[PDB]
Design a protein around this ligand. Structure first.
Ligand code: TA1
Ligand code: GTP
Ligand code: GTP
Ligand code: GDP
Ligand code: MG
Ligand code: MG
Lengths: 426, 430, 120, 430
């Protein structure tokens, strides 16, 4: 029943996916050993969406862990929930990609794509009614951006009709940790736009901005950014794992949220968000959730929505609430801020409400937005690419892998084409 | 005798069914288990077996299981025939395209199979009461596929249409007008009398009359159920002037294509408010024509009445009905078309309204069901047509409809048909 | 020919509406026309047929004022080939001085236009 | 309903807030932790959450942290929303220049952000109660920047101004008139009714009436809080003649620029002195017009009264108010302008004054709040204008204001504006 098959690519992808697995195992009440320990039967009916039923009433997640290094596999298996995973889905090479997209897409990951495909196919045939694939990866470096796009293309080729949603942490200028990120991002979005039905753009800088300027953490580590990602990870698929008054699965979002086929790079967000010493004082009412939700500080990318127009926004609310105030805020936001939403398309909001709130939360709101302002990251990536493209650096480490100049040129042309379409409707 | 098969399509249809049958079991005194503790007043809606069990003649069809298998878990899990409540595997994605060609295609054959096995025990089948929503993918596509085959397998039988219609301001999806426009061919060609439901108008109703600040859709349902039960009141209980379901629709319909009447219910009033009013027949008669009581956000004072049907129930004397309608025809603010100086059809039933114990509606000795066709309702379509233009002018979301097997020009036939309907409801007003 | 509108045109227009027999009591025009129902009464004198007065209800809440004026835009103004933006309509409904008069000026001219037209 | 957002700017503003909220929590019975042990009388000043906590709608803004993070350490550290009390990094240096252009520029955007997040829960927001000091750098510059944006974002809302004004003799800084003169544009253009506070006059008040030889500013605060609470008394408690905050300022204001009334409070009396007096309504009425009880060192007998407002609270009968005001109009020493032979606005409230346990004020069954505009108050500006000349004649300290981004001629516009105000308050006295 609407089974969803998860794939992890790169160290970023597999660690954030592992923490997502931890979060939704707590939501479904799954013991670290894999046994069920939840309180209500509501956690139990839609276990088949993320986990496989096995002997002893223990449940194994439908995740395929893919990497080119064994060290990340070693860390994840030794992590808090390493034991719950399938030993077979730990499919990995030995030599790393070295943050080389060409390595992952032609040499290093091409040999392991056969060993990942035979696992993803068995996972899919284990499903009763497959709905799609949620894939976690990073546009930075050559592992997540490199092999991730290749296997995404393969699964899209053999699964042409299933939903393809990807959550992509993507490079940024001021919190860049690797020199050669823009090549990787340009060569990755080239395949992401053509193949993926859904892509969530996540930028690390805005995660940092959330954890300082909203969460007031003095030392928010990398796991806290993983937590911020996993919150929306769990939120976007809430409707098809739990009952709610307005059920909106992934394709419910899709039919409402992407006006033209290529305009599918979106803006995630989550509410509520407070510091430790300020949650005691906050009124968690739904209107306040809304005023927090469309704030430019709550978002997870540097693209400020005030520099563009929203095409479609998705607000999947959660908890035991009525909904007239839901409609009134969703119309007030787009009425008083009608200059920030495309007036030519009148009702830019898709509303979904779930009946069971997250554990420890009385209510929650998950933000998904289509703004023309998201081109801020794309054109900046293209500009940084040009600053390292126009007269030939670092290309020997790609062309040595069989990579060629004209494909780089087409990738840049496609970035320019994308930013053109997203500026067209602004 | 006098059986009616109720169809419930989409989430809205199945849940409005859950509320309607909740009302019916209470008013006819059936437990949630189907038993009768202790007249054939239930034969109109419920079938009887040898063991003393009341089995409803209803189908819950949803292309997704969540709401229906939630019904399989609720208090009415044993009331219904489990495999007459049909669930699909893939949701309709708020898309008319897949619901009408792709996903409903494999399931409709079982739906008509169950409809046939519901028809074959009905000795006096009167008509069909199908419930859905215009904006929903299932309620659009699957209903569009279903009335097509019902109109050729049960062409003689009347098909009443109770549909939930989008608001001028309140909306839950951006694709709702797309789903709504391709539904218009079904109501025009494969429906006999359609009843349109607006959520924002009834939101105002519950805000002003019920004094409740925070109702849910369940409060909406526990009044749509009253409106449908009041329409079916004459078929199930005794009355001085019982109106047959065919008599009803003959009184509503002036022309085969003009069969889209508004609905209002009175007295919609809270329990704290029922005490201080005597609640005469006249005031419930006067309250129905008040634009602040309309079920659809359109001003009747902006339009002209063609057919008027007074469906009273409870302790109402027909003399008081005549006295009220004399006052109604007395005021000029309510101007009827030059078609109907006779104006009013009167129907009286002896059963007082049945109150839901968890409801927000008061217990009143008298209740009236107002169903009227008017030219003012074209405004509820006069914003939807301009709305549909505002999306179709770029081909806003058509690649999905194209990608799921719909012809691109079906939108062209759709807005041509709505324009024809809008014209048809304007010439008759002269 | 006066290129712009002088203060005297306001007075001319003030007197003309009084010249028409209108079923209204003694009160200022700038606050009555704001309602909207008076405008269609004015036009009743010219063509009683197109005016229905089975469509707009006299109230004095801004919500009903604008709801009536919007209706009037698409049922009387459209026949006169006359179009006005909502930003203006807001001001008419607010009993704004000068604003509704800026529509009263061309309204009568459009009516006389319709009179001259050889309609069959 | 009837909410008011209180603004506290500068050291004087934040500490007078600390005393005001100390009075409010006691009079409305809230613990320093925000809880209610056991009417919606607190909705005017405090917001309520689900856990039963009273959260004040107030902002403490200081360009320096010492006083506010002292509040973060005091008994009211948990009462306030911690990040609605905003601290800067660089002090204002008693300079209007940096506070209005340089240092308050980076912090004002957060201040208005918090003001918006305080406005969005106020369903019936009545007005603003901003507290500061004229002579202070923050209370001048940051307030000047803040009322500018508040007047364009909350133009309709009333903005009451409670400001602390320098003494003719007592002063704490040499630059105080410089800060005071550039504040005059704000009160004239971006304020609706300003209340001026003189430290030396109230020093005389506490010296003579309270019999206390050695009070602090905290004693000043524990009577400014009473004056502001008495002004807000009608909005929070029941009264025979409750005066709305808009009604109040409509009764004070004869012209848009004449909105600068004096304030006095009665009975200001020590605990040892409260015993030997019956303390009738008449004597508290007579004590208010006594120049030895004025809050600003100006002689009302030197001027003419325009508007008079009798804000009584406690066990006061309005007949006694009429009897007192008959005597008030009887004497000639109190000559009102030929504008107001009606003279007096009367406001009565049923709540007796609330006593601070550590205060120096006695417990009295009756209390009256006196607010009156008069032409004699121009003398309090008639020494400040000659004062400002006495510095500006060499350009005494302008290089700092010039060095921090102020135009040199802004002083010229400043004394031109104060001269215009001084003239405006003289012609109306004829
Ligand atoms: C005592 C109390 O009320 O504290 C709450 C809490 O509400 C706060 C402090 C929580 C708290 O979260 C954090 O401290 C945090 C730190 C870094 C990154 C993200 C969160 C909380 O840890 C998080 C936790 O939230 C949940 O349990 C949700 O179900 C959440 N799951 C997790 O956060 C989680 C934590 C550890 C392991 C597995 C899951 C979730 C959210 C969306 C979708 C699915 C699940 C709750 C209620 C609290 C604490 C414990 C302090 C917040 O978290 C969430 C996700 O709601 C941070 O801002 C929100 C709201 C609150 O301020
Ligand atoms: N009045 C009322 N309308 C409802 C209710 N439930 C759903 N609707 C209407 O249904 C519309 C959207 O349709 P959906 O919620 O998607 O339900 P559906 O018909 O099953 O369509 P799909 O989910 O795509 O299969 C909304 O615009 C609502 O107006 C209800 O309980 N009361
Ligand atoms: N009546 C009274 N006046 C005060 C009090 N505190 C400060 N003042 C006034 O404030 C004036 C000087 O301002 P500051 O002390 O510098 O306070 P400020 O407004 O924050 O100005 P900056 O320190 O420059 O930011 C003095 O002349 C006092 O009259 C107080 O507690 N009571
Ligand atoms: N948000 C987030 N970003 C990360 C995390 N770990 C690493 N990153 C950054 O994301 C980028 C992704 O590149 P990387 O995954 O190392 O390339 P790969 O090895 O080829 O997959 C790196 O440059 C890191 O700076 C994390 O846990 N969260
Ligand atoms: Mg549905
Ligand atoms: Mg200071």
């Amino acid at each position: 029943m609407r089974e969803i098959v998860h794939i992890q690519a790169g160290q970023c992808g597999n660690q954030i996916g592992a923490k997502f697995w931890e979060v939704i195992s707590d939501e479904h009440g799954i013991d670290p050993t894999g046994s069920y320990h939840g309180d209500s039967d509501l956690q139990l009916e839609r276990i088949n969406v993320y986990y496989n039923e096995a002997t002893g009433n223990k449940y194994v997640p439908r995740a395929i862990l893919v990497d080119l290094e064994p060290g990340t596999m070693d860390s994840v298996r030794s992590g808090p929930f390493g034991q719950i995973f399938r030993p077979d889905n730990f499919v990995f090479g030995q030599s790393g990609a070295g943050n080389n997209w060409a390595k992952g897409h032609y040499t290093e990951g091409a040999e392991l794509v056969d060993s990942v495909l035979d696992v993803v196919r068995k996972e899919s045939e284990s499903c009763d009614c497959l709905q799609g694939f949620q894939l976690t990866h990073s546009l930075g470096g050559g592992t997540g951006s490199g092999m991730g796009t290749l296997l995404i293309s393969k699964i899209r080729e053999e699964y042409p009709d299933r939903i393809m949603n990807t959550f992509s942490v993507m490079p940024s200028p001021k919190v860049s940790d690797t020199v050669v990120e823009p090549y990787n991002a340009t060569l990755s979005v080239h395949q992401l736009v053509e193949n993926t039905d859904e892509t969530y753009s996540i930028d690390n800088e805005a995660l940092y901005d959330i954890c300082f300027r909203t969460l007031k953490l003095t030392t928010p580590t990398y796991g806290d950014l993983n937590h911020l990602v996993s919150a929306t990870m769990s939120g976007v698929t809430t409707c098809l794992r739990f009952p709610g008054q307005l059920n909106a699965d992934l394709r419910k979002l899709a039919v409402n949220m992407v006006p033209f086929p290529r305009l599918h790079f979106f803006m995630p967000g989550f509410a509520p968000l407070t510091s430790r010493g300020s949650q005691q004082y906050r009124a968690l009412t739904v209107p306040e959730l809304t005023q927090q939700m469309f704030d430019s500080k709550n978002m997870m990318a540097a693209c400020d929505p005030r520099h563009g127009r929203y095409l479609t926004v998705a607000a999947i609310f959660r908890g035991r609430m009525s909904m007239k105030e839901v409609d009134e805020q969703m119309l007030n936001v787009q009425n008083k801020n009608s200059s920030y939403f495309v007036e030519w398309i009148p009702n830019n909001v898709k509303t979904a409400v779930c009946d069971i709130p997250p554990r420890g939360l009385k209510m929650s709101a998950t933000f998904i937005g289509n703004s023309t302002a998201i081109q801020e990251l794309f054109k900046r990536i293209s500009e940084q690419f040009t600053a390292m493209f126009r007269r030939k650096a670092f290309l020997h480490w790609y062309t040595g892998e069989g990579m060629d100049e004209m494909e780089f040129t087409e990738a840049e042309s496609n970035m320019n084409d994308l930013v053109s379409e997203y500026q067209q409707y602004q | 005798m006098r059986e009616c098969i109720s169809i419930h399509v989409g989430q809205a249809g199945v849940q409005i069914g859950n509320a309607c049958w909740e009302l019916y079991c209470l008013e006819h005194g059936i437990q949630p288990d189907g038993q009768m503790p202790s007249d054939d007043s239930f034969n109109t809606f419920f079938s009887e077996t040898g063991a003393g069990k009341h089995v409803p003649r209803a189908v819950f069809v949803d292309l997704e299981p969540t709401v229906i298998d939630e019904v399989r878990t609720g208090t009415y899990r044993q009331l219904f025939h489990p495999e007459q409540l049909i669930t699909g595997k893939e949701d309709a994605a708020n898309n008319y395209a897949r619901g009408h060609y792709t996903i409903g295609k494999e399931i409709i054959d079982l739906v008509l199979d169950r409809i046939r096995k519901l028809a074959d025990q009905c000795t006096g089948l009167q008509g069909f009461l199908v419930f859905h929503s215009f904006g929903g993918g299932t309620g659009s596509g699957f209903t569009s596929l279903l009335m097509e085959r019902l109109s050729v397998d049960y062409g003689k039988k009347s098909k009443l249409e109770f549909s939930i219609y989008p608001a001028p301001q309140v909306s839950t999806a951006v694709v709702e007008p797309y789903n709504s426009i391709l539904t218009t061919h079904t109501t025009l060609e494969h429906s006999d009398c359609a009843f349109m439901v607006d959520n924002e108008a009834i939101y105002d109703i519950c805000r002003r009359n019920l004094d409740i600040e925070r109702p849910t859709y369940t409060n909406l349902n526990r009044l749509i159920s009253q409106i449908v039960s009041s329409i079916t009141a004459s078929l199930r209980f005794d009355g001085a002037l019982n109106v047959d379901l065919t008599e009803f629709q003959t009184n509503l319909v002036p022309y085969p294509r003009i069969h889209f009447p508004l609905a209002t219910y009175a007295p919609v009033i809270s329990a704290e408010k029922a005490y201080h009013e005597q609640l005469s027949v006249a005031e419930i008669t006067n309250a129905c024509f008040e634009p602040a009581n309309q079920m659809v956000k359109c001003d009747p004072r902006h339009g002209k009445y063609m057919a008027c049907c007074l469906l009273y129930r409870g302790d109402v004397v027909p003399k008081d009905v005549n006295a009220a309608i004399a006052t109604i025809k007395t005021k000029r603010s309510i101007q009827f078309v030059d078609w109907c100086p006779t104006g009013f059809k009167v129907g009286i039933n002896y059963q007082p309204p049945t109150v839901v114990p968890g409801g927000d509606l008061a217990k009143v000795q008298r209740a009236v069901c107002m169903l009227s066709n008017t030219t003012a309702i074209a405004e509820a379509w006069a914003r939807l047509d301009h709305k549909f233009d505002l999306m179709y002018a770029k081909r806003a979301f058509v690649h999905w409809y194209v990608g799921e097997g719909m012809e691109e020009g079906e939108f062209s036939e759709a807005r041509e048909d709505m324009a024809a309907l809008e014209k048809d409801y304007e010439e008759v007003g002269v | 020919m006066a290129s712009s509108v002088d203060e005297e045109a306001l007075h001319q227009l003030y007197l003309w509406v009084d010249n028409i027999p209108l079923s209204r009591p003694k009160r200022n025009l700038s606050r009555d026309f704001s309602d909207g129902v008076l405008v269609a009464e004015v036009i009743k004198f010219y063509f009683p047929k197109m005016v229905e007065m089975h469509n707009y209800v006299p109230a004095n809440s801004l919500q009903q004022k604008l709801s009536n004026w919007g209706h009037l835009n698409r049922k009387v103004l459209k026949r006169l080939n006359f179009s006005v933006p909502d930003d203006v309509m807001r001001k008419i409904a607010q009993c704004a001085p000068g604003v509704v008069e800026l529509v009263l000026i061309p309204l009568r001219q459009r009516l006389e236009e319709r009179q001259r037209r050889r309609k069959q």
